[PDB]
Amino acid sequence: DHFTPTPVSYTAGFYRIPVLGLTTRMSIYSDKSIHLSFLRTVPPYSHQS
Amino acid sequence: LRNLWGPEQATGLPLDVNVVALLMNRTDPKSLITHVCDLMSGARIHGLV
Numbered sequence: 774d775h776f777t778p779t780p781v782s783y784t785a786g787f788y789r790i791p792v793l794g795l796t797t798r799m800s801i802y803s804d805k806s807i808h809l810s811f812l813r814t815v816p817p818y819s820h821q822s
Numbered sequence: 823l824r825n826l827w828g829p830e831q832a833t834g835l836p837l838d839v840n841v842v843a844l845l846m847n848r849t850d851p852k853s854l855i856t857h858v859c860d861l862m863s864g865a866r867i868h869g870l871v
């Protein structure tokens with residue numbers, strides 16, 4: 774029940790490399806300061822709003 | 823870091839208080855995650871500085 778691509782992106786993120794996480798559409802992945810180089814191709818649930 | 827623990831810490835209410843002073847001069851992420859998995863498994867260290 775993790776559903777987290779965050780350890781992969783953060784392991785490749787000490788070199789600050791963009792990692793495409795394509796698991797879910799959570800809004801916690803939409804932050805700029807928590808996720809600096811984590812650029813995905815999926816939109817969050819605010820687009821449903 | 824070794825001298826800060828010996829003569830100080832007079833009001834020590836826990837009992838499992840032990841300091842570990844290490845120096846990782848080079849910070850590649852493979853060795854960093856290796857040190858994290860070695861220190862967290864190393865008798866349950868609850869402090870990461």
Ligand SMILES: *[C@@H]1O[C@H](CO)[C@@H](O)[C@H](O)[C@H]1NC(C)=O
Nearest residue numbers: 843844845846847848849853
């Ligand atoms: C890290 O560098 C210090 C000198 O700044 C040295 O004394 C120490 O032995 C080094 N750590 C290692 C490789 O154990």
